[PDB]
Amino acid sequence: AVVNTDDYVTRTSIFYHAGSSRLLTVGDPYFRVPAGGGNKQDIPKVSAYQYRVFRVQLPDPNKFGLPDTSIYNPETQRLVWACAGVEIGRGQPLGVGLSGHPFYNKLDDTESSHAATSNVSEDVRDNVSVDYKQTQLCILGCAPAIGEHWAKGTASKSRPLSQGDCPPLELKNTVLEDGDMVDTGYGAMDFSTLQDTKCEVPLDICQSICKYPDYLQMSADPYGDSMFFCLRREQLFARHFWNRAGTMGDTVPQSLYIKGTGMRASPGSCVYSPSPSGSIVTSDSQLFNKPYWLHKAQGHNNGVCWHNQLFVTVVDTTRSTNLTICASTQSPVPGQYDATKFKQYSRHVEEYDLQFIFQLCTITLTADVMSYIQSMNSSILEDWNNKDPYDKLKFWNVDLKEKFSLDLDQYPLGRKFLVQAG
Amino acid sequence: AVVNTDDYVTRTSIFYHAGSSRLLTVGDPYFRVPAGGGNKQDIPKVSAYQYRVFRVQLPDPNKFGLPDTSIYNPETQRLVWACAGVEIGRGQPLGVGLSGHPFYNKLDDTESSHAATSNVSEDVRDNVSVDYKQTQLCILGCAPAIGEHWAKGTASKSRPLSQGDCPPLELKNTVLEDGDMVDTGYGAMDFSTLQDTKCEVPLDICQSICKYPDYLQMSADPYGDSMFFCLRREQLFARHFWNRAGTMGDTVPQSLYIKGTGMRASPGSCVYSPSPSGSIVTSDSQLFNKPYWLHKAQGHNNGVCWHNQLFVTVVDTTRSTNLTICASTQSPVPGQYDATKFKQYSRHVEEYDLQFIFQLCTITLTADVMSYIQSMNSSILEDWNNKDPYDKLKFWNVDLKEKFSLDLDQYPLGRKFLVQAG
Amino acid sequence: AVVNTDDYVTRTSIFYHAGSSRLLTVGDPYFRVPAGGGNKQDIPKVSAYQYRVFRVQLPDPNKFGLPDTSIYNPETQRLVWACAGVEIGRGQPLGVGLSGHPFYNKLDDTESSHAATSNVSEDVRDNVSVDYKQTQLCILGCAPAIGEHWAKGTASKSRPLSQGDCPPLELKNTVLEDGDMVDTGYGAMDFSTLQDTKCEVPLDICQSICKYPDYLQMSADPYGDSMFFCLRREQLFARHFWNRAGTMGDTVPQSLYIKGTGMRASPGSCVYSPSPSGSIVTSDSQLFNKPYWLHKAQGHNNGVCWHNQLFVTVVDTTRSTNLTICASTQSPVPGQYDATKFKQYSRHVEEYDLQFIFQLCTITLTADVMSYIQSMNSSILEDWNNKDPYDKLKFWNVDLKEKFSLDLDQYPLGRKFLVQAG
Amino acid sequence: AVVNTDDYVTRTSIFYHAGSSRLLTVGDPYFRVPAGGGNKQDIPKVSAYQYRVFRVQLPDPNKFGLPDTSIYNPETQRLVWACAGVEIGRGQPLGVGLSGHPFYNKLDDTESSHAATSNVSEDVRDNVSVDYKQTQLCILGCAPAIGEHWAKGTASKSRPLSQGDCPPLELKNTVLEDGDMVDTGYGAMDFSTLQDTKCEVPLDICQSICKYPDYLQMSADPYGDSMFFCLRREQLFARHFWNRAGTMGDTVPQSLYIKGTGMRASPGSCVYSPSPSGSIVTSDSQLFNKPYWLHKAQGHNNGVCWHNQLFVTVVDTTRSTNLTICASTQSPVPGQYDATKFKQYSRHVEEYDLQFIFQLCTITLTADVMSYIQSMNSSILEDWNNKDPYDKLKFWNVDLKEKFSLDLDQYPLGRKFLVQAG
Questions:
Q1: B19 by DSSP, 3-state: which?
Q2: In b/e form, how buried is each residue of B26-52, taking b as 16+ CB within 10 angstroms?
């Protein structure tokens, strides 16, 4: 039986402040520009619509000089960090930003077409762009958060898919790594294996995998290391209504319409999909640049950072202004305009600032306390006396071993904390 | 004289937590696809705009293992489950999804006499789509919830109905089953029998029946087994204004206008119908993933689950993103684009999770108490010592007989319940 | 000097509940369809944009069976009902509906016309529709609500009204009968007498009289029997901007523009009129299906229902979804589509439900008290020992004489009332 | 270790009110007009989207005669003004103001193009305009605020940016001078060096630098003189979706689409940029014309005005209506209209009013205090017994040396302050 951490992890009255420096990154918002091919280094794919997963690395509280190493007894107890406050700071101003496709699969406007439209010609693919759904979310945990998405099912012998026939869909659970794209309004699926056209969604998610946090599973997780802090705020609406070019896989039953003559003799495309649209983005509904206190967690883990680790999973689309930079091919910069003599670039900036307030905690290693932790996570006892199960995954590592401080008064969050406590 | 249950149903201090696993279903959002035609097994019609009616099957508390069978005396009392806490869980992300009809009966734009169209023929039906009205609701009871809808009234034998004339309308009460379509903004009626065109409404409600819960009737119900919990949240607006093609049944009174000449000599179509539209869909106005406690119900039944049953009626259209899947007809996936070589499919997902906190109750079987229950529902006494009156209707059965648990602590809803109780 | 009823109306502790059955009505939303033309019996005009004036008829408390006929001395005092609780119920789902006119007088779009427009020839009327302003309101009093509207009075013997000149506008107070049209955003006037064109507004108000409540007068009423309860909630915006065809009556002064040449030599039409539009209709700002307790009235009358009457004036435009009905000319229903073989019809439904909590009251008839009531309304004394000032006006009569009950516990509003009372 | 000012700055009970007169300025909203061209004296560039940085100059409280010069001991201590109240008054009415560019680089509409568009020939630049993002911000400090912006990185001596290639982006900190441009919704960058086209953004930020307050840095500031009061409110949305004319710098990876033929053989422009748009501007969300009290500042400086200075940094775009002026070339003003015989001018007005409530404060000059202020800012002690480190920057000097008064009662803010205190 799983037990609340407040029943074996005794807390102290010793609080530390820890803050990252300035986490900053720029790059192309649509795709990584590979190294060399003009200029040196490589420009990373940096979008407002991808998950930020910071792996916060903490100092080992046991091999760490204390303000007084008589807070505990190194013979019968161990130390753990317990997160008490977090403030994710966001840098750039509020802005909206578009994403698009040079050959988007848009047959024709079905919102209110002036009349009939084109026929099923070929390559009626147009160039369109669309601002995505607006999402803000923040997840804390001592383990990475689990996402879900839809992928092709399994290729069991029983019935070999007649090729052209629609595959079965399987919900797949996965870890949210840094760089994974969010649900933008086009559903959370694997577009690289479910859409052979590679033209049904905009460029940045076209060949990517859009995940969505598995809140249901993470809440039902027995120990609750996945999330002990969750903030979400999403909103969107439908801007334009369109068709899909191609033949209908599922045939519309004759019992659903009266047959006609000419073009209207047979039913056209009945696969509709609306362009997403996050509405007004305001400061009043902003989720960040505010401190949050983890009073008492939702799960059984109450902010205890096992393995001296901390995962901060962040999404903020309320800052998606993509910079437009253009240089001329000619050096003296000609006085006669000519679009071909200018190169257009597109860069996006992400600026973060993590701030924490940690609390020192003691665990009395009694016999059954140990065998409980044994069952929970044996590797916890090993470190207290190597391979990590996460080294295969892409994280934005933030070292804080050198960032802890005792005087909270000297830091913004530190003052806010002291105020809040009384 | 109907009596409050809190007068003959004594509540204990024993609480159980029960939960479904993960209720999940995928299918076509418009029409069920006949199996075998391409692939094995049928593709169910799964829409966001159809009632989910879960039939929760509880274990008989009398034939059930208690932590102590001295909670009551089996010689003069019986046990009932009373509902105390509920959490309906929703998995997939927020999103909008369109519905349409290849041959919608849209004459022309009456919103603002635009410009002209371009058609030969005389059949002017266009392929239009529309986002439905946005609706959220949740009904709890120990009996299925009652719906209303409009249908063709019985043609009287005295005065027959000459073909072409308008039928009289009759309001019809009925049981909401799992799969019944909701009010999408086109009203609540039998479209399969009040529209011979089969083109007045989009495809998924085309040959169906849209039902609205009869809240007035269920509130007026004497005992109140129909609903002891009701949450509703709806909103919509008029997007586009349109005309209907066809001859006018009711002739516009000559005295409501001045005759013109040419086309304007006689009045055109005067049957207008607007395309519905739920505006912004936000998380801030969400109704689900939040727990709700049944403190004191609206009706005379106070969460008492007679027949050890529970009917959870749910509508949530705030998650209606329809996936678009496409496979190529060629195996190597050609490097030249051609719309004819790609089969477009449309799939929708419905992920649920049901959580309950049930409370053990006792009923002392006295003379008048039994005679009371006799008149209320004789079948109740029968089971305490077979055919079920609902065995004709479609329900999503959720068996919770192996899902009851005494330690609320171990479960998400359980913890919240304990907190709320103090 | 008028006195507050609370000084001469003593209240008891006896409360009754009374509710109508289910007030229901269907018909054409634009105009009544003269009987027998295609089918037996008239089809009433039933629109969402017309007042609903229920005349509730209460039993005479004196000639009424009491739980104990010693609540008063029938020699020295009489009894009066005094309203304490009200709940108007609405049945149909939330919807938006359109109104139009086959020959709407719309010259041309003036919002942002592409350039110049058509010649002011003769007949350019277009078939346009429009969703009206969104209005909810509810009035209670023991006397019908008063409304105001604009009509052309009379030409006095002195000056004449030249054929073609603009008539003088006179504000006219009047009783709101059931069926009267509300302000739809085209102002509150008599379109049948002020507009000879009969094409300036949509069809249902084309020849009607739109009335608005004269709140200003009803609050200034000495006794305040006209309203002791008043709820209102309206909203709208301007959808499209248009011109009016015809010659200008008031000539635009030369000192307000510079003359041009060609068509721009003389100014065109300067009679602008926007099409109204109620925006998002939501359940969140709904006014009905909720109980309201008349704690202390605004006027002098404190819910005292003189003459055992009660007037309930209601407007609800948040439920205006008009049902589209179409039958075919052919019996076997042809498989080939042809709009001419389908008669279209338009039907609106209005479903209500009135519930009340009434409080029995006592008036001790002393010298001055009788002389006061004499001056207030002599006909009150007469009934305590014949015509009525209204029997010329159309009301929706709801007889609740057989609907009074003593046990509030048996009814929804009753329970709600008990809870509220503590 | 930095210390809160409240530990070495003892406040008195003396309160002064000071107010500027009517700060007022008119000018061209897009660019400054060189003098003598058509009329004497220059026409300054006054825009609603540029920072207002007031450098308020306080009277030296030491060389100041007091209501009583025994508040302190001029031998052992010094006087300092501490701010306690601020009210920034705005004059002109609320309004929306546009900005544009005669040759805006807009290829074509990618929101929902009718289909394909024009050839990427040479000059397709159209005259477009756009209302900016809606920003309100107010910052107080005894040192000017810090802004950030993106500028052309410092050329690699060992990687010369080959002409045409994309330059490296460097985030640059800077003092916010009066006149600096704010983020309008096109990002905060140096358009004069990052966009050679000189046609990517509207005219008023075409050759300027858009700065955004570095809130992160100013909060991490050790002493916190830069801001001890910060009020922000910003909102916007995406109005129209546009392409960029020019050649693509970063080439779209071939594995992201399927090649076509004709114009759709090669991908088009994939640099999208939405026109910004602040939505409804209402008085309900207004940030000015209200008084604000600095109870306890965020940083370590609690409103202490060192050097008897004050830096008010104000941004307000809710008042951007640009007056349209036009005179005729002809003196008698012609009776025939001709657009050529009229000169169109554009002017914008900015009206301010600064009101303050200052508190007298003492500093007992001891050893450690002096050597702290020594470390904090030596120049503070130097004035107590020259060159200013901000004499290079453009500020709006507000002299208040002759505006301080003791009777708060006689002033608006004065009264409100008295009331608020009790």
A1: strand
A2: bbbbbbebeeeebbeeebebbbbbbbb
Check the CA dihedral C316-C319-C320-C325 and report its sign: negative
- Phi first, then psi, for residue B273 (nearest 5°) are -145, 125
Question: Is B303 strand, coil or helix?
Answer: coil
Domain that holds residue C52: 1-422
CATH number at residue A375: 2.60.175.20
Total domains, chain C: 1
Q: What span, in angstroms and rounded, lies between the C-alpha atoms of D325 and D343?
A: 8
C250's tokens: 């008031």
B335 to chain D: closest CA residue: D258
Strands in A229-236's sheet, in edge-to-edge order, are: A396-399, A52-57, A309-316, A134-141, A229-236, B281-282
- Please tell me the distance from the alpha carbon of residue C320 to that of residue C95, in angstroms, as a whole number: 5
* Contacts of C137 by beta carbon, 8 Å cutoff, 6+ apart: C213, C230, C231, C232, C233, C234, C287, C313, C314, C315
Pairing of β B247-248 and β C342-364: parallel
DSSP state, residue C145: P
Query: Which of B271, B385, B395, B289 has its CA nearest to residue C324?
Result: B271
The answer to whether A363 and A7 have CB atoms below 8 angstroms apart is: no
* Contact residues on chain D for B337, CB-CB shorter than 8 A: 258-260
HSE-CB for D93 with a 13 A CA cutoff: 3
Which phi-psi region, left, alpha or beta, contains residue B308 (left: φ > 0; alpha: ψ -120 to 50)?
Answer: left
C299/C296 Cα distance (integer angstroms): 9
Is B335's CB within 8 Å of D260's CB?
A: no
A258: exposed, middle or buried (C-beta count within 10 Å: 0-12, 13-18, 19+)?
Answer: buried
End-to-end CA, chain D: 36
**DSSP state string for A285-340:** T--SSS-EE-SS-SSS--SEEGGGEEEEEEEE-SB---EEEEEESSSS--SS--GG
Nearest to B345 among A235, A249, A279 (CB): A249
Q: Exposure of C72 by Cβ count < 10 A (0-12 exposed, 13-18 middle, 19+ buried)?
A: buried
Which residues, in sequence order, are CB contacts of C359 under 8 Å at separation 6+?
Answer: C11, C12, C14, C15, C16, C81, C82, C83, C84
Whole-angstrom distance, CA of residue C59 vs CA of residue C309:
9
> Nearest CB to C103: which of B197, B232, B260?
B260
| E strands present in A142-197 | 146-152, 169-175, 181-182
Whether the Cβ atoms of residue B140 and residue B314 lie closer than 8 Å to each other: no
Closest CA to D48 of D147, D131, D128: D131
Distance CA C373, CA C3 (A): 11
The CA distances from residue C406 to C13, C65, C68, C356, in Å, are 12, 11, 12, 12
Q: Which amino acid is at C318?
A: T
CA dist., res. D206 & res. D184, Å (int): 12
- Cβ–Cβ pairs < 8 A, chains A and C: 8
Supply φ then ψ for residue C194, to 5 degrees: -95, -20
Nearest by Cα to D54 from D403, D413, D399, D317: D399
For tokens 């422009």, name the residue. D269
Give the whole-angstrom CA distance, residue B174 versus residue B189.
Answer: 12
Q: Does the distance separating the beta carbons of C339 and B273 come in below 8 Å?
A: no
Distance from the Cα of residue A32 to its chain's centroid: 18
| Residues contacting residue B177 through CB under 8 Å, at least 6 positions apart | B51, B53, B144, B393, B394, B395
